[PDB]
Amino acid sequence: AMITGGELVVRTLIKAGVEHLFGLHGAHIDTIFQACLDHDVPIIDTRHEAAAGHAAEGYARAGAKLGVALVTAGGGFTNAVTPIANAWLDRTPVLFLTGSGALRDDETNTLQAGIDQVAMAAPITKWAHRVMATEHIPRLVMQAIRAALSAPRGPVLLDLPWDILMNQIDEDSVIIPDLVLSAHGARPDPADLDQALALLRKAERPVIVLGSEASRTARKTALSAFVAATGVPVFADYEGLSMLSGLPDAMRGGLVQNLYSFAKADAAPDLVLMLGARFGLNTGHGSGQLIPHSAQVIQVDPDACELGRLQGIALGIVADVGGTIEALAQATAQDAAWPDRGDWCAKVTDLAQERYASIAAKSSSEHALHPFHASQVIAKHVDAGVTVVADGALTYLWLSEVMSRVKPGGFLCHGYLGSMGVGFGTALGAQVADLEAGRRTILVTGDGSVGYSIGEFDTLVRKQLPLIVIIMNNQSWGATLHFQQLAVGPNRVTGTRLENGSYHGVAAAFGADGYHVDSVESFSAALAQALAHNRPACINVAVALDPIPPEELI
Amino acid sequence: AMITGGELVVRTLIKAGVEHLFGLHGAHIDTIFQACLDHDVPIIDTRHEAAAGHAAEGYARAGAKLGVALVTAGGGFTNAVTPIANAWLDRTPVLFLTGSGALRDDETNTLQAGIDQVAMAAPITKWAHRVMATEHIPRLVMQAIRAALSAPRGPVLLDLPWDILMNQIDEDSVIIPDLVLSAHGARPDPADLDQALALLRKAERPVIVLGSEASRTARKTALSAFVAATGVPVFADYEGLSMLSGLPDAMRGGLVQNLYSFAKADAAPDLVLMLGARFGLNTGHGSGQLIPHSAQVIQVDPDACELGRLQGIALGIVADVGGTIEALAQATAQDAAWPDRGDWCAKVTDLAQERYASIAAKSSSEHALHPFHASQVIAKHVDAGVTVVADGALTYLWLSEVMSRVKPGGFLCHGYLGSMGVGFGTALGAQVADLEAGRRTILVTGDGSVGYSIGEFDTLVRKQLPLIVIIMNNQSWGATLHFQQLAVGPNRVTGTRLENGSYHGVAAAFGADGYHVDSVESFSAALAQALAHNRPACINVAVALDPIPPEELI
Amino acid sequence: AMITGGELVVRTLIKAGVEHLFGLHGAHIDTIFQACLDHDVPIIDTRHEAAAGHAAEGYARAGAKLGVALVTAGGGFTNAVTPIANAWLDRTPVLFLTGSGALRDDETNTLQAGIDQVAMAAPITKWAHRVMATEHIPRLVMQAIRAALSAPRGPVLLDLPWDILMNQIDEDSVIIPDLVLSAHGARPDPADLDQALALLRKAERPVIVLGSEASRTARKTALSAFVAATGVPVFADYEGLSMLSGLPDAMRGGLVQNLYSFAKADAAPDLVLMLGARFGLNTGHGSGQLIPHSAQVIQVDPDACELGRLQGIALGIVADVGGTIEALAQATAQDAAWPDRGDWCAKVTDLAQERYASIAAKSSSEHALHPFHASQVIAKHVDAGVTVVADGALTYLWLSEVMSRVKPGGFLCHGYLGSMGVGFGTALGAQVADLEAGRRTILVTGDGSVGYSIGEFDTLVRKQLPLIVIIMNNQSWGATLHFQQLAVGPNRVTGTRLENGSYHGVAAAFGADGYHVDSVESFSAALAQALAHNRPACINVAVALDPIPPEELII
Numbered sequence A, B: 001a002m003i004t005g006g007e008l009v010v011r012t013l014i015k016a017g018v019e020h021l022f023g024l025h026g027a028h029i030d031t032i033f034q035a036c037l038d039h040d041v042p043i044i045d046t047r048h049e050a051a052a053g054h055a056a057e058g059y060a061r062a063g064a065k066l067g068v069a070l071v072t073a074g075g076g077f078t079n080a081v082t083p084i085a086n087a088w089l090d091r092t093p094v095l096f097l098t099g100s101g102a103l104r105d106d107e108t109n110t111l112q113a114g115i116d117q118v119a120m121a122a123p124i125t126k127w128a129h130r131v132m133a134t135e136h137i138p139r140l141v142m143q144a145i146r147a148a149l150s151a152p153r154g155p156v157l158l159d160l161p162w163d164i165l166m167n168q169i170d171e172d173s174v175i176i177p178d179l180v181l182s183a184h185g186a187r188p189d190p191a192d193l194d195q196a197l198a199l200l201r202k203a204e205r206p207v208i209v210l211g212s213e214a215s216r217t218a219r220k221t222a223l224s225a226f227v228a229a230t231g232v233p234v235f236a237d238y239e240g241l242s243m244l245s246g247l248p249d250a251m252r253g254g255l256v257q258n259l260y261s262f263a264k265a266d267a268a269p270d271l272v273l274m275l276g277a278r279f280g281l282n283t284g285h286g287s288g289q290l291i292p293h294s295a296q297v298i299q300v301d302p303d304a305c306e307l308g309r310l311q312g313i314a315l316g317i318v319a320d321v322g323g324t325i326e327a328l329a330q331a332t333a334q335d336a337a338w339p340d341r342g343d344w345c346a347k348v349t350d351l352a353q354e355r356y357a358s359i360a361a362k363s364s365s366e367h368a369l370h371p372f373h374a375s376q377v378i379a380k381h382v383d384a385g386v387t388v389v390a391d392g393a394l395t396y397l398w399l400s401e402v403m404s405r406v407k408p409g410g411f412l413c414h415g416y417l418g419s420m421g422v423g424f425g426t427a428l429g430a431q432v433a434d435l436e437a438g439r440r441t442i443l444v445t446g447d448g449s450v451g452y453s454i455g456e457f458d459t460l461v462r463k464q465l466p467l468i469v470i471i472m473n474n475q476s477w478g479a480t481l482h483f484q485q486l487a488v489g490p491n492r493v494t495g496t497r498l499e500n501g502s503y504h505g506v507a508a509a510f511g512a513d514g515y516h517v518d519s520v521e522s523f524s525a526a527l528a529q530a531l532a533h534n535r536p537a538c539i540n541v542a543v544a545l546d547p548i549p550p551e552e553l554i
Numbered sequence C: 001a002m003i004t005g006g007e008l009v010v011r012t013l014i015k016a017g018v019e020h021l022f023g024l025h026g027a028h029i030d031t032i033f034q035a036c037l038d039h040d041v042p043i044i045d046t047r048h049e050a051a052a053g054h055a056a057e058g059y060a061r062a063g064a065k066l067g068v069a070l071v072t073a074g075g076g077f078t079n080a081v082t083p084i085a086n087a088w089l090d091r092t093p094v095l096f097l098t099g100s101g102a103l104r105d106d107e108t109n110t111l112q113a114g115i116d117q118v119a120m121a122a123p124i125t126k127w128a129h130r131v132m133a134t135e136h137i138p139r140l141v142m143q144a145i146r147a148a149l150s151a152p153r154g155p156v157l158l159d160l161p162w163d164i165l166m167n168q169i170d171e172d173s174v175i176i177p178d179l180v181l182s183a184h185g186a187r188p189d190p191a192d193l194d195q196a197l198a199l200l201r202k203a204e205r206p207v208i209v210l211g212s213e214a215s216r217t218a219r220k221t222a223l224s225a226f227v228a229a230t231g232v233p234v235f236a237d238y239e240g241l242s243m244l245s246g247l248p249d250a251m252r253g254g255l256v257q258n259l260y261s262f263a264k265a266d267a268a269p270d271l272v273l274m275l276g277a278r279f280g281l282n283t284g285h286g287s288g289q290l291i292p293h294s295a296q297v298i299q300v301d302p303d304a305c306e307l308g309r310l311q312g313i314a315l316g317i318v319a320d321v322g323g324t325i326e327a328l329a330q331a332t333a334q335d336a337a338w339p340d341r342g343d344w345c346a347k348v349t350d351l352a353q354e355r356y357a358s359i360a361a362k363s364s365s366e367h368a369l370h371p372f373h374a375s376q377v378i379a380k381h382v383d384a385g386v387t388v389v390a391d392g393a394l395t396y397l398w399l400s401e402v403m404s405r406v407k408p409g410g411f412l413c414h415g416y417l418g419s420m421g422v423g424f425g426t427a428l429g430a431q432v433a434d435l436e437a438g439r440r441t442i443l444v445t446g447d448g449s450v451g452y453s454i455g456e457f458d459t460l461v462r463k464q465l466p467l468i469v470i471i472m473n474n475q476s477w478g479a480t481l482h483f484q485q486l487a488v489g490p491n492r493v494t495g496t497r498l499e500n501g502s503y504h505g506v507a508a509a510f511g512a513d514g515y516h517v518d519s520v521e522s523f524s525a526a527l528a529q530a531l532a533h534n535r536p537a538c539i540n541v542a543v544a545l546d547p548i549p550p551e552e553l554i555i
């Protein structure tokens, strides 16, 4: 009945409800591997701690739950920092467990010791802390979990010294707490809710914009009730998109980028209800290009700093986005009637169709496969049964154009960090989450980005994870090459070409199914075949580089 | 119409509703002084930045509003770090504005430059940031204010480089935003509130315990309604104490320390509703000595990490404490009649009286004025018209014993930092806030502690702030001297005696009224006279050192 | 005559003498790419910022010069953190140039912004700083270089906001400073030098142990003179090893690990002169197993905190190691003849031979190629014309056993960070530095470790860098699997097997020459052929997992 600190870690994780970890082995953290082995808790071990970190993010994002990453001292930790930073800006709930030097061997210039891992993580975590006593493990693990899961969600680092984990203590001398933290988020004051609803009622052209916090709490039933009662069209940033999948067509505004053309059509929203969507990269900053300067804005966010960050707002509410959605659905259920918004919804629909049609008209695959056409081939397969993860740059910009009319089970794109290459790990973790949900994961990445984590084909094969990796291959770091041509000059391309390498050949050498395609017909065939089998796959798609996606042209 | 960065700062503060600043002049921040002069906004300039920072804290705490501290580059900032740390652990909303080296003169080994002020403040602030452009000033000032005022309240550092402040910009090119942040805090989900009230109704011996977040939002009307509807007795840590002042005697449990004697009297609460009271120093940590292990605990806090930090809880709600109190009042205004709690309330009263009488029985001023007797002299004058600020150590431990019986308008004691000396600046700021409240501030401090900021008698006189400073003088750093005697040995006193100096003489040399007293009669007379006139005063009170306050043992 | 901040960066690097950068493109740093293009300064662009950072390290280490890494905002920077940490612990002079968010767009929740990159680098750099004005670029780049190159060498982070780099200023409005920093480091006070030499003279069994700072300054001629005058045997940690390559065999003690068997031989050194070798992982910590507790220790290091960190010393000197070697050479060029130390040098030689022979006697390739035998195949090709880079774990522990008797041009192994995977980028950078020297780079890595940076086969092919990557393949994360079996139990292997994948196939799919081998004969043939051509290669070597290397046995 003596147990290790690592055993305490795992017992606390199990009690919290954790069922998977992502990681890479080291002696420093072996006690956690041994405890997981004993308790039949899978640790999905990758070929790089970065991929493990991103997998924990992908698992969290796809499954709307806590992701758990597990890395060893020193380079284990430093290899996980891009995931930490990505989860930080994305508001993704990930518990990063890292080993560190033994406290008893402090300042001995020893193996993997001497990196101030807590200091390195401090700027990019909700909380980061080094455990000082084995007996503290359960309470501090649970504290870390509460930090990560609470609004706004985000990453936490718990640093566990080798001696602290190896230490044995009497199991009856320490209690393993429950996770006692309400599942229901805090909601607005009724006066604020009444004011928001009065504004929503009076608007001529109201819209809702969902952000990541909407996705984390995933109150889709309540969202549907609210949206059905009010008839208000709903848009979302990338992270919020999959929250629109259960909504009636007339109310699906799609990606918030679609608001761009509304002003020119004399149709700019006069009221915007932002639910966890920040003023920033995905919402046009303070430009007024998507969220009009002439609109009254009601913003709901758990972080007061965000409220009107870049633009004057009418009503700033600090509350949980999920809780607020519940409250709005509760309020509008008591309502006899809401203004008819058929005409406005139709306008929203028509404007989306006009964008899509315009792109379709301009796109030609006469000489090489057009990125828009390649994106459409994927779109035909996207529904509730699929999670789409997007990496690259031009690649996701083109892909985004087909994403609003489909209803993905999940959609995981770059956030503010825009870190090329994070998608592979992200998609691998998403696929683990998706297994329980009966979903198939498709990664859509660029030829540049896939190189970051290309070893993970080995992991797919060892773990029999049926991730489909589609590489949009334009023989370049594409968006950066576009930048050079457009911002500097046509003869100023340097350091951005990638005219080498058979990626499907690399996949095949790792035991995954490899395909190379270069047309709508060949791509359609390959994708259909890949989807028909429960096997990991790489589809290398030769695509044109020259086309400029609308988001880039903007 | 060209205006300075400093003018932008002050326009934004005014628009936010700021009416006072505390600080100490430097050239680096002169543009802010000049703008305040133009706009008739007082800056209360102290003799030490630490006193200024603590004054901003006291103003925030006594006034339930934002405090603003203003300090210059380098030593101005480093002199403010004890206030920042105190505000951090006390959850006190203070905006610290600091000057810093000019960006254009970066890395020139120049005057007051080269201190990474934001890095130093990062571990002890909700947000710390250095402004990069004059045009960003209004949006970042307002962002900082939203960070400080949001639940849980806390300090923010906004660092304003000299060139950023001196730069002039067209006033028409930058908008000064409003403070658009709901005054109403987020509330619990009704399911959680229902469960909490169901538990409260079934309990045989329920208690409520208030913490600092309750004092920050000051929802007194709602608290009264809730308490009258349920008949449940209410306790508080030091920071929540003044929130009990408007309650009927039967439901005033007073300081949470009074729960100590309940288990031995077979009267331990079976339910504890913690409203912003954390598990920690003031609540008995996880010992169960105040919050029984056998009790079911409902905990409400804006920080999920705090929920069941040191002890298992039954229900953990993340919400604003003020919003929650409003929600509870609203719910209990509409539900059935609540069970009578007269007998339990009388038990609470009797146990408090038994404690007070026991101390009274033991306390003798035969040979020297006893600290309990001195405390009673003060208590005679405490009501809504008074703010009591407490510093020293033995001094506040004795004072705490008389505080539950009285109903102070404000009570500001040490929090977790326990930093001797913070009281003087705190009380000076409190007196400023108390002007518009029609309150008189009394600082009760130790002879050791008063030395930290003794030059502030000058500030009281220059600004005509009628603070009464009562020095409980036991010619020692008292609690520390007791530590040496009790934990080490009677012959082991070293570095703790202070058998020198006429504090009243020091005050008089700064132009404040000085008194030296040594008995109940002489002390009563001096305090009565000091209270009769709106003049700053120092009352140097000779008190016994040997008596051990109940809390010291515990 | 208006030029960008990025042009100022590049003009300053050029004036300092930088001839290569390693990096990965981003728009945030394009102005630096464009300026390098104009000036014909190569940027070796990799498939991961980590590989670019490790390449800059390898270039610095192999080249004994400044390495420069160039990365974009946000994820560009965060992907470079492992290189920064590695350089930090290894005392390697690398200037990490990173983009960051524009100052004018501060706090706008925009692309790649919002990471406090300086705060993240602070605990693992000599200096980290974000540039506040375009006019400050030349003086702060040069200041950064002076920080990296000064003793003890280490990594510096210079963070260059996008607007600061794109901003254009009059090229004549700012001076580009020269690099004015003495090449000759500070030396000991003569009293301290005299005391050290008096102890060295009186000692019965003196040894010298070199550390990384000896490699950075590479005072080979002075070292040769000093060692010839005194006849004292010289050992080194991994990073100091190539500094022994120009010494006579008699005075080459080799890797400091060899000191382990000396006490049982009644031959423990009575004096140890530590020249930038710290007390720590490579020197036996404070255990006295290599540096005896009974020895008088003279320690010379540019960081006073290192001096007797873990063990009492007799004389603690803060000075540059190169400057100290020059001082020692100067002193011993004008003093009395030194005691003959032939018998002691012979004992050193005998004990090394006993270790090697013992390993050889125990090693069998009957059923699978033994790691010691695979290591011997490599050693046959190691001389001044070769840089050996070592990664993996059991892989380098075995490799270490053959490295003392050969004289490598370069030897770059794991330092204190022990970060599996850093070797590929390191070797790629080393191969760039080795070009001008006519040296060939060989990476000896594990099947586990190679996976970290395997996309760099692409870079080798795109840049025609003839790096030979040797994968010691035991189908596992080997040392960690041994840990599980030895420290936990034979039935407790979890998360450590890697029984999948054709690494030579991966290399081939990137266009590199691939070989798969499983015997002394096959491996010898593949290596000979790969060395005969100036082509990148991958040699996948099937080796046994079960053998325990002496360094693990000791542990």
Ligand SMILES: Cc1ncc(C[n+]2csc(CCOP(=O)(O)OP(=O)(O)O)c2C)c(N)n1
Pocket (backbone or CB within 6 Å): A391, A392, A393, A394, A395, A396, A418, A419, A420, A421, A445, A446, A447, A448, A449, A450, A472, A474, A476, A477, A478, A479, A480, C024, C025, C026, C027, C049, C072, C075, C076, C079
């Ligand atoms: C970690 C990281 N490194 C560099 C960049 C700079 N960058 C932006 S887009 C881009 C090109 C991505 O190329 P690819 O993955 O092939 O997608 P494509 O644009 O060609 O579709 C690069 C290198 C970045 N955003 N993140």
Ligand SMILES: Cc1ncc(C[n+]2csc(CCOP(=O)(O)OP(=O)(O)O)c2C)c(N)n1
Pocket (backbone or CB within 6 Å): B391, B392, B393, B394, B395, B396, B418, B419, B420, B421, B445, B446, B447, B448, B449, B450, B472, B474, B476, B477, B478, B479, B480
């Ligand atoms: C800034 C700071 N310095 C030192 C201490 C240690 N300390 C705790 S109690 C105490 C004695 C305070 O003496 P006094 O203010 O005269 O109050 P007394 O206990 O005598 O009533 C000291 C020095 C502290 N808590 N904070």
Ligand SMILES: Cc1ncc(C[n+]2csc(CCOP(=O)(O)OP(=O)(O)O)c2C)c(N)n1
Pocket (backbone or CB within 6 Å): A024, A025, A026, A027, A072, A075, A076, A079, C391, C392, C393, C394, C395, C396, C418, C419, C420, C421, C445, C446, C447, C448, C449, C450, C472, C474, C476, C477, C478, C479, C480
């Ligand atoms: C970045 C990093 N991750 C994990 C570890 C833990 N670790 C130590 S040795 C080892 C095995 C290395 O395997 P391989 O590269 O194949 O070399 P081998 O020991 O099998 O020769 C691992 C994973 C580490 N030291 N660094």
